[PDB]
Design a protein around this ligand. Structure first.
Ligand SMILES: *[C@@H]1O[C@H](CO)[C@@H](O[C@@H]2O[C@H](CO)[C@@H](O[C@@H]3O[C@H](CO[C@H]4O[C@H](CO[C@H]5O[C@H](CO)[C@@H](O)[C@H](O)[C@@H]5O)[C@@H](O)[C@H](O[C@H]5O[C@H](CO)[C@@H](O)[C@H](O)[C@@H]5O[C@H]5O[C@H](CO)[C@@H](O)[C@H](O)[C@@H]5O)[C@@H]4O)[C@@H](O)[C@H](O[C@H]4O[C@H](CO)[C@@H](O)[C@H](O)[C@@H]4O[C@H]4O[C@H](CO)[C@@H](O)[C@H](O)[C@@H]4O)[C@@H]3O)[C@H](O)[C@H]2NC(C)=O)[C@H](O)[C@H]1NC(C)=O
Ligand SMILES: CS(=O)(=O)c1cc(Cl)cc(COC(=O)N2CCC3(CC2)CN(C(=O)c2ccc4[nH]nnc4c2)C3)c1
Ligand SMILES: [Ca+2]
Ligand SMILES: [Ca+2]
Ligand SMILES: [Zn+2]
Length: 806
């Protein structure tokens, strides 16, 4: 109930909202039914259009036009954005040469350059290029400001998760908005786009930009709009807000466009109908820029132009139904679309068996267009698991296709030509980003960047301090003209031991068969120098990884590889090694095949044993420094130390082997050397953060040897590949992955063939940023380089997509 009898005489687009049932007149009163009776009248004016004709010039002010061309309009704040143009013979903004904005040029009373966040829905990355002809304003912004080729959204590439990520800098698994659709088990309730539930604040976590501004005494415009306010009125309202007396006037404002998403769903991404909704936007950007010029603000405001996701060609026929894969299709409940999520229809169903459901969905049709995962097994770069609103069963869907539950859910429950929500590394899903303003650079391209990073930029731009988020503060300094944030390397918490020889073979009892007992003054001295580290700047190019939590670990040196061995986890946390282009792969000689040797540097108490492995028919073992890539047949013995051993499933061993044996040399060739760091990853809680001892769930049977859930690798070389990895004195180049340590290869439908045909494909799928590994290992890389720390952060936010050209 609401008694909407109060008036809006004077509360037109008021900023603070009123507590029910006194009627409201803010830009959202519509969505809550509770507008003021005269709201429509007083605040949705429409007469004479949105543009000043040449006759309306210097008219007598009439209070119920939509905007005014009367001589007072400028200083009343309600001029039409083209008023100066027509009536006072001024040019449109777009018709101006871009001038470098060296210092911010603000009218007095403006403490700080205000921020305008202009968000356009579904604005695919390539619209900038393929549309430039019909978008002159948006092309000025881009070319004169600072843009990236494309901005990577987040999964799921849906509207709500992506808009609240921009405003929080948090993954959806963190803010809790994990789809446009969303059942919550604890709340017993569903969140849908149509309905009122979306308003309950209980779905929304983290601190959005607007709350962050306000908590710190920076006034914030309103960010959401009622869908019934026309865009031209939206811009007038913003320009109206800008005319407010200093202490009533917001510092950060927001525009939102339903286009081009709305059209794009109907015509596909480049339906020839699409040219026109694009023009609208550019027209609107024109109005906004024209209005800023009106107010002498146009060289003082920072505008951010940005999308939430792109659009892809998608149609009703390219739809897989599950009722073609299952039997009891009515015992589940599916969240369908460009991605499937599955759950029981009842938890009064204890006869629900998720293993069976997944099974019945794996490689079941030769050209299957989705793939089932349990949520913990999704690529870690998606960060889509650590929430109870995300169902344990997920269906990752092919670009261009849909998943639905039954045929009856599609014909009467075809029409459209485009959808969105696919894997976020897909090129059709990429969106846009330009920054124009005094605080941005002038005619400057920046590399692609994930959207999680904007919140930090926006706090910087507004003089705020960022609430804890998932971006990497400083990683986007290369965008800004001046930076509030001087980022700083985190201090090392744990210091390493550097253990010497302290044990004799006989003190060990690991049950470790080896054949190595045949063996000077020359190189009985050189090998000593290997275990001290005369080759330490050969295999550790960027300095020792920093351990950022409290533990006891050792630095073990060798001829070919350095490792940080954990006494607690009983394996290395990292192994680093250079493979120059001239490196050579070799075989594992017949006598040395089941060779596992005791490490006389580490206690038998802090070593693993071969016996637990023999007794475990589920577990085999593997090696971090590959034996295949030994420098000498003498150095090859080094790779067989029990301290280089890690546990591997036989199924995973296949993937691992091909990577070490084949791929490492491959890259080594292509990039003129690579430095490879590798190690385990323990994340049983799928939070994306390193597990500690007390949370280990799996052990190598009958031992204290914990089983990694993933294994990672960082592969770095010179960015200028004409320099050897181990002499690159310029920017770097990296690429990483985090493969799930799994006992089958059911993820890979080509598994039963040659590794040459499916491994490299599975690695590309599970690629990751160095930063992601950093969260998962609690480590910190690239400590000793010649490069700026800001440059290094950018490096670590990088994701290799293995996609084609945008
Ligand atoms: C990306 O970045 C984000 C953000 O930085 C990372 O997410 C953060 O990660 C932290 C580590 O997991 C986690 O810390 C938790 O916090 C627990 C509860 O904290 C609650 O209060 C928060 C208040 O916010 C304040 O914000 C500002 C300050 O900036 C203030 O001015 C305001 O006034 C506020 O007070 C609140 O944000 C948080 O909300 C969560 O829960 C809501 C619903 O209940 C959600 O709507 C909301 O979205 C949050 O939910 C997310 O996080 C939870 C995990 O906590 C996750 O399960 C959800 O799926 C979702 O993702 C809370 O309400 C706190 O209890 C924890 O401390 C326990 O564990 C530690 C471990 O040692 C103990 O030291 C401690 O004693 C304690 O143990 C106690 O509880 C145990 C079990 O209950 C028990 O056994 C033991 O005996 C003790 O009783 C812990 O510190 C943050 O919650 C989280 N923040 C966010 C935004 O999600 C994320 O990791 C990053 N991702 C990656 C991979 O990089
Ligand atoms: C970037 S920011 O400045 O930080 C920011 C952050 C947030 Cl959280 C919100 C905004 C402004 O948002 C609004 O004004 N809202 C109302 C209109 C809709 C979005 C929410 C369009 N919505 C659909 O319902 C829809 C659209 C496209 C779709 N494609 N497919 N389904 C769709 C559904 C509702 C700006
Ligand atoms: Ca959207
Ligand atoms: Ca964890
Ligand atoms: Zn859409």
């Amino acid at each position: 109930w609401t008694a909407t009898s109060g008036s809006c005489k004077g509360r037109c687009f008021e900023l603070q909202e009123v507590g029910p049932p006194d009627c409201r007149c803010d830009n959202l009163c519509k969505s809550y039914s509770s507008c003021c009776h005269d709201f429509d009248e007083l605040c949705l004016k429409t007469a004479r259009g949105w543009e000043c004709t040449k006759d309306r010039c210097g008219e007598v002010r009439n209070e119920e036009n939509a905007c005014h061309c009367s001589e007072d309009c400028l200083s009343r704040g309600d001029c039409c954005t083209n008023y100066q143009v027509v009536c006072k013979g001024e040019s449109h903004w777009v018709d101006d040469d871009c001038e470098e904005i060296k210092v911010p040029e603000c009218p007095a009373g403006f403490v700080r350059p205000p921020l305008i966040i202009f968000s356009v829905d579904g604005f695919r990355a390539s619209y900038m290029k393929k549309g430039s002809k019909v978008m002159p304003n948006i092309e000025k912004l881009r070319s004169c400001g600072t843009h990236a080729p494309y901005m990577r959204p987040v999964y799921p590439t849906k509207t709500f998760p992506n808009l609240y990520t921009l405003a929080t800098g948090l993954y959806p698994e963190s803010h809790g908005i994990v789809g446009n659709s969303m059942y919550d088990p604890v709340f017993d309730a569903s969140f849908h786009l149509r309905g009122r539930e979306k308003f309950n604040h209980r779905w929304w976590g983290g601190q959005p930009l607007w709350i962050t501004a306000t908590k710190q005494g920076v006034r914030a415009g309103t960010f959401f709009w009622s869908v019934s306010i026309p865009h031209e009125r939206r811009i007038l309202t913003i320009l109206q807000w800008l005319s407010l007396p200093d202490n009533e006037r917001p510092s950060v404002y927001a525009f939102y466009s339903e286009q081009p998403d709305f059209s794009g769903h109907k015509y596909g991404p480049f339906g020839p109908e699409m040219t026109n909704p694009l023009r609208e936007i550019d027209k609107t950007v024109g109005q906004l820029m024209d209005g800023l010029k009106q107010l002498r603000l146009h060289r003082c405001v920072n505008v951010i132009f940005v999308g939430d996701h792109g659009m892809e060609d998608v149609t009703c026929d390219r739809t897989e139904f599950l009722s073609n894969y299952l039997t009891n299709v009515d015992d589940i409940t599916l969240v369908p679309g460009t991605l499937g999520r599955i759950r029981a229809k009842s938890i009064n169903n204890s006869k629900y068996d998720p293993k069976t459901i997944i099974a019945a969905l794996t490689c079941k049709k030769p050209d299957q267009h989705f793939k089932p995962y349990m949520k913990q097994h999704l690529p870690k770069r998606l960060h889509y698991a650590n929430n109870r609103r995300i169902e344990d069963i997920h269906l990752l869907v092919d670009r261009r296709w849909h998943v639905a539950r039954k045929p009856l859910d599609v014909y009467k429950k075809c029409f459209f030509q485009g959808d969105h929500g696919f894997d976020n590394k897909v090129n059709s899903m990429q969106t846009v980003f330009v920054g124009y303003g005094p605080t941005f650079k002038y005619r400057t391209k920046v590399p692609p960047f994930e959207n999680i990073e904007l919140y930090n930029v926006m706090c910087d731009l507004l003089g705020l301090k960022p609430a804890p988020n998932n971006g990497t503060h400083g990683s986007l300094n290369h965008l800004l003209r001046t930076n509030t944030f001087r980022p700083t390397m985190p201090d090392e918490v744990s210091r390493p031991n550097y253990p010497g020889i302290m044990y004799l073979q006989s003190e060990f009892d690991l049950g470790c068969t080896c054949d190595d007992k045949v063996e000077n003054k020359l190189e009985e001295l050189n090998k000593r120098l290997h275990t001290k580290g005369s080759t330490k700047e050969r295999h550790l190019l960027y300095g020792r990884p920093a351990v950022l939590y409290r533990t006891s670990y050792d630095i073990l040196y060798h001829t070919d590889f350095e490792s940080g061995y954990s006494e607690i986890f009983l394996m290395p946390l990292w192994t680093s090694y250079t493979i120059s282009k001239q490196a050579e792969v070799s075989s594992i000689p017949e006598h040395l095949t089941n060779c596992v040797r005791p490490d006389v540097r580490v206690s038998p108490g802090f070593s693993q044993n071969c016996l637990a492995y023999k007794n475990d028919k589920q577990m085999s073992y593997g090696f971090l420094f590959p034996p295949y890539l030994s420098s000498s047949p003498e150095a090859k013995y080094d790779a067989f130390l029990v301290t280089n051993m890690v546990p591997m499933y036989p199924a995973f061993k296949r993937v691992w082997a091909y990577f070490q044996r084949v791929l490492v040399k491959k890259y080594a060739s292509e990039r003129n050397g690579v430095n490879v760091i590798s190690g385990p990853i323990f994340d049983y809680n799928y939070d994306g953060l390193r597990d500690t001892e007390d949370e280990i769930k799996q052990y190598v049977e009958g031992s204290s040897i914990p089983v990694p859930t993933h294994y990672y690798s960082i592969i770095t070389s010179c960015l200028d590949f004409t320099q050897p990895a181990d002499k690159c004195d310029g920017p770097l180049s990296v690429s990483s992955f985090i493969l799930p340590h799994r006992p089958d290869n059911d993820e890979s439908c080509n598994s039963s063939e040659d590794e040459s045909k499916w491994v490299e494909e599975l690695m590309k799928m599970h690629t990751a940023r160095v930063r992601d590994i950093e969260h998962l290992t609690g480590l910190d890389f690239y400590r000793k380089t010649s490069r700026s720390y800001s440059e290094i952060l950018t490096l670590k936010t990088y994701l290799h997509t293995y996609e084609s050209e945008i």
